[PDB]
Design an enzyme around this catalytic site. Structure first.
Site, PDB file in Angstrom:
ATOM      1  N   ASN A   1      69.659  90.271 100.578  1.00 42.12           N
ATOM      2  CA  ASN A   1      68.316  90.654 100.984  1.00 42.12           C
ATOM      3  C   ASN A   1      67.502  90.699  99.715  1.00 42.12           C
ATOM      4  O   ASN A   1      67.745  91.532  98.860  1.00 42.12           O
ATOM      5  CB  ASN A   1      68.321  91.986 101.698  1.00 42.12           C
TER       6      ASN A   1
ATOM      7  N   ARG B   1      62.922  84.835 112.225  1.00 39.72           N
ATOM      8  CA  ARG B   1      63.283  85.762 113.282  1.00 39.72           C
ATOM      9  C   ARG B   1      62.598  87.087 113.104  1.00 39.72           C
ATOM     10  O   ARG B   1      61.874  87.295 112.149  1.00 39.72           O
ATOM     11  CB  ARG B   1      64.800  85.972 113.319  1.00 39.72           C
TER      12      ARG B   1
ATOM     13  N   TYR C   1      75.341  86.662  99.152  1.00 35.51           N
ATOM     14  CA  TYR C   1      74.484  87.322 100.115  1.00 35.51           C
ATOM     15  C   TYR C   1      73.423  88.126  99.404  1.00 35.51           C
ATOM     16  O   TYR C   1      73.707  88.811  98.419  1.00 35.51           O
ATOM     17  CB  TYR C   1      75.291  88.235 101.015  1.00 35.51           C
TER      18      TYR C   1
ATOM     19  N   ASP D   1      63.991  91.074 113.153  1.00 30.82           N
ATOM     20  CA  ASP D   1      65.121  91.974 113.234  1.00 30.82           C
ATOM     21  C   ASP D   1      64.612  93.337 113.614  1.00 30.82           C
ATOM     22  O   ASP D   1      63.769  93.891 112.919  1.00 30.82           O
ATOM     23  CB  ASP D   1      65.863  92.061 111.899  1.00 30.82           C
TER      24      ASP D   1
ATOM     25  N   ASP E   1      68.065  86.468 102.969  1.00 35.89           N
ATOM     26  CA  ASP E   1      66.954  86.928 103.789  1.00 35.89           C
ATOM     27  C   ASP E   1      65.732  87.321 102.948  1.00 35.89           C
ATOM     28  O   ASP E   1      65.836  88.161 102.052  1.00 35.89           O
ATOM     29  CB  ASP E   1      67.387  88.128 104.632  1.00 35.89           C
TER      30      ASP E   1
END
Ligand SMILES: [K+]
Ligand SMILES: [K+]
Ligand code: NI
Ligand code: NI
EC number: 3.3.2.8
Lengths: 146, 154
Positions: free
Chosen positions: A52, A96, A50, A98, A129
């Site tokens: 960012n 998207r 994961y 957020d 992301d």
């Protein structure tokens, strides 16, 4: 509310999950507004990661869960509007917005994001992301990278 | 004037599915995009804008959008004024619903400073009749600016 950008595809299907993996991701997304690392972590495989991207990567399932937890400490998702979702070769992609709120200051901000997810047997074996971190910090007055 | 500061080599990330296949054009539009990527190192806006439709747009998301082919070229050309593509590497390409997606690394040089940085980019491309009607790159602008000392914002 989140108004939808002029440049968003007007193909009616580009928003809807087309495949299994995509349904998942959309759900996971829906589950992000729970602001719950322990709950969120469930969608992940043991062998995952994961990141960012303006921040450092988290490898292994419990790192990932821990990063999530720490983020949820200063901020919380108010909303995830996913404009485009698509897939090929085992990776799923989401454009998207957020709506993130900063707990210390209370200010929120609408962050433009494009994420990639890697799934294996419906297991998130990857999540990345991409976004501009600075304009977020500036908006809500919450620094996250020196 | 500053000497050209040492290009950094492109690393295959732990997560970049080796495989590839996953980084290959599986569809016509994808082959187009992969080709457009190839074109970027030309650092020639004239070469690039011929990939675009009239109804099109271009935006590096930390920067203002350019709508319309005319505004797109101004943007592209303007960037090539202070900046230059040394390389582009696409780990992952994919497509659905009229959009292509590329998880890639951009190797850029800041002309005024001579300095070089490797930008982690996720970009999305919309095509129509085989032409780019949209192009948006997602990345962190500050880490680039600081790395090479080329503040671009505003
Ligand atoms: K879709
Ligand atoms: K592919
Ligand atoms: Ni100088
Ligand atoms: Ni020098």
């Amino acid at each position: 509310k989140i108004e939808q950008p002029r440049w968003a595809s007007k193909d009616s299907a580009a928003g809807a999950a087309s495949t299994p993996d995509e349904k998942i991701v959309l759900e996971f997304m829906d589950a992000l507004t729970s602001n719950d690392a322990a709950k969120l972590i469930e969608y992940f495989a043991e062998d995952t990661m994961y990141q960012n991207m303006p921040l450092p990567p988290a490898y292994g399932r419990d790192a990932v869960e821990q990063t999530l937890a720490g983020l949820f400490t200063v901020m919380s998702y108010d909303a995830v509007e996913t404009f485009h979702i698509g897939s090929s070769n085992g990776l799923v992609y989401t454009e998207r917005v957020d709506v993130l709120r900063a707990l210390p200051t209370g200010k929120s901000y609408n962050v433009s994001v494009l994420g990639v997810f890697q799934l294996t047997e419906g297991k998130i074996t990857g999540w990345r992301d991409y976004f501009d971190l600075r304009e977020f910090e500036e908006a809500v007055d919450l620094p996250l990278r020196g």
